[PDB]
Structure formats: structure tokens, C-alpha cells
Amino acid sequence: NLKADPEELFTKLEKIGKGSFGEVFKGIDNRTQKVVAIKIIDLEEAEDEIEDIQQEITVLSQCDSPYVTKYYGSYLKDTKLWIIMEYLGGGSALDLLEPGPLDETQIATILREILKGLDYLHSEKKIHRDIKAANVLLSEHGEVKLADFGVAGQLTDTQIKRNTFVGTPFWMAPEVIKQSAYDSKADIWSLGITAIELARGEPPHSELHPMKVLFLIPKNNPPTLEGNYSKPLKEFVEACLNKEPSFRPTAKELLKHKFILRNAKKTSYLTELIDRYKRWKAEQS
Numbered sequence: 001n002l003k004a005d006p007e008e009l010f011t012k013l014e015k016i017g018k019g020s021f022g023e024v025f026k027g028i029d030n031r032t033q034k035v036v037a038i039k040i041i042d043l044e045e046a047e048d049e050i051e052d053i054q055q056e057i058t059v060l061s062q063c064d065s066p067y068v069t070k071y072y073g074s075y076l077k078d079t080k081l082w083i084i085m086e087y088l089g090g091g092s093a094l095d096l097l098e099p100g101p102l103d104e105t106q107i108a109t110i111l112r113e114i115l116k117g118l119d120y121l122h123s124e125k126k127i128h129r130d131i132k133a134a135n136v137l138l139s140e141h142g143e144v145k146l147a148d149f150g151v152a153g154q155l156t157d158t159q160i161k162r163n164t165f166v167g168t169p170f171w172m173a174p175e176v177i178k179q180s181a182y183d184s185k186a187d188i189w190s191l192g193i194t195a196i197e198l199a200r201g202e203p204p205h206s207e208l209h210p211m212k213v214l215f216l217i218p219k220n221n222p223p224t225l226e227g228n229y230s231k232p233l234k235e236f237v238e239a240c241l242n243k244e245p246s247f248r249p250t251a252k253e254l255l256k257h258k259f260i261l262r263n264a265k266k267t268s269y270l271t272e273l274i275d276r277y278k279r280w281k282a283e284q285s
């Protein structure tokens with residue numbers, strides 16, 4: 001139930017996004033005049049990535065949550081496939097880190113919304129598998145959503161675990177790297193790495209070659225959050241970063257963690273961060 005003739009409904013504007021996926025363009029829904037994001041994939045060109053493109057569309061089409069990038073439709077235009085989704089103009093959580101550090105209220109607020117997204121996905125038996133600040137996108141007013149479902153996994157009655165080596169090495173769970181049978185608990189590990197990223201600006205091992213961390217992560221003790229951070233933040237990270245996945249809490253459980261309860265505030269306060277990035281970006285080299 002793919003669609004056709006996207007230009008009858010959408011106007012394609014300037015380029016805004018990247019990846020090796022394809023490219024992302026700003027666009028307009030001519031029906032509502034809302035701005036959308038249009039990912040253009042050359043099917044004549046990105047052979048074998050095809051199965052992953054198919055998977056991204058499938059997962060996207062099945063999600064209906066304010067914490068997951070809204071899916072408009074996928075469209076065939078000659079050689080190209082148009083994947084049309086929610087436009088979010090507040091940048092990524094990674095962007096927001098560029099001008100300088102966050103405070104724990106900001107970190108907690110962002111984590112809380114990530115957790116709402118994960119709870120939704122995991123309740124749908126979906127696993128994101130590439131949780132990291134770059135894949136956490138904000139609206140211009142501080143709403144926080146998960147993006148980029150290109151390597152998302154689906155559990156079913158006959159497949160209760162996944163095995164595939166996917167993700168971004170610094171953020172990957174040890175059982176994913178070892179390609180053991182894993183599930184949503186993998187996202188919880190990645191979430192812990194993302195919490196360190198939000199607190200420190202970078203994940204553990206970020207200056208090392210990715211191939212290196214592929215052995216370091218299964219072997220070494222789990223990372224901890226070091227530095228002058230509140231005890232609840234440190235324990236939040238610790239909870240997520242358990243080598244044994246069954247000992248990691250669920251997203252649901254983490255929503256009630258003291259770090260989240262004591263420090264998360266209204267998402268609209270994140271506009272302060274969005275403005276800081278816009279200012280920073282405007283005076284940049």
C-alpha cells in the first residue's frame with residue numbers, strides 16, 4: 001500500500017539532512033501547509049540497502065506516537081523513493097550539545113521523553129537499535145522524538161529475540177556485539193550510553209577506533225558516569241549499563257527513576273537549548 005505521484009501533494013524544498021541512507025529535504029504538505037521532511041532514496045543506486053529501506057518504511061508506517069517521527073507515506077517517483085515524515089526544526093540532541101554542556105534538568109527532560117518513545121516502541125515489540133543523541137530530534141518548541149528507524153527490529157510470536165549486528169559501535173550493547181539473542185533491553189543499554197553522552201558530550205571510548213570498541217565493550221566492565229554529577233544521575237546510568245540485559249530495567253521502570261522524577265521539567269524549557277544552538281550555529285566558522 002505504497003503511494004505514487006508525491007508532487008501532487010507535496011512540494012520539495014531545500015536539502016536539510018544526510019546519512020548514506022540517501023538525502024533529506026525540507027518539504028510542504030500542500031494540503032495543510034505544514035512543513036515535512038522528505039528522504040529521497042535512489043533505488044537504481046543503493047542496491048542491497050533495499051532490505052533496510054523496506055524495513056524502515058515498515059516500522060515507520062506502524063508507529064503512531066508523539067514520541068516517534070510521524071510518517072506521512074512512502075512514494076514512488078520514477079527511479080526514486082520518497083519517504084515523507086515529520087519535520088522537526090529544533091535540531092538533534094547532538095546538535096544541542098555542540099555549544100556547550102547541558103545541566104541535569106535538561107538531561108533529565110530529554111531522557112524522560114526518550115523513555116516515553118522507548119516505552120511506546122517496546123510495547124509494540126519494536127527495538128530501535130540505534131539510540132544515540134543524533135537520532136533524538138526536537139521540534140522548535142522542545143518536543144522530543146525518536147528518529148531514524150533504518151535498523152529497527154521487530155519481535156513476533158515466532159521470533160522473540162533478535163540476533164543482527166546493527167547499531168553504532170560506541171552505543172551498542174555487549175550482547176548485540178556478540179550477536180547473542182537479544183531484545184528491547186539492548187535499547188536500554190544504548191540509552192545509558194546516551195545518558196553519558198548527554199552529560200559529558202560524548203559516549204565512552206569516543207576517541208578510539210570503532211573496531212576497537214567492538215572488543216572493548218564485551219570485555220570491559222560497563223562504563224560509569226564519572227565526574228561531578230548527582231548521585232541519581234550516576235545511578236540511572238549504572239542501572240542501564242548492566243552487562244546482563246535481564247538486570248537492566250524497562251523503559252517504563254526508568255520513567256519512575258529518582259533522577260527523572262526529581263529533575264525532569266516541561267519540554268518547552270528546552271527552547272532555551274534550541275535557541276543556544278541557533279545562536280551558536282549562526283556565528284560559527
Ligand SMILES: Nc1nc(N)nc(-c2ccccc2O)n1
Binds near residue numbers: 016070086
Ligand atoms: N531521519 C529523519 N527523520 C525525520 N522525520 N526528520 C528528519 C530531519 C532531518 C533534518 C532536519 C529536520 C528533520 O525533521 N530526519
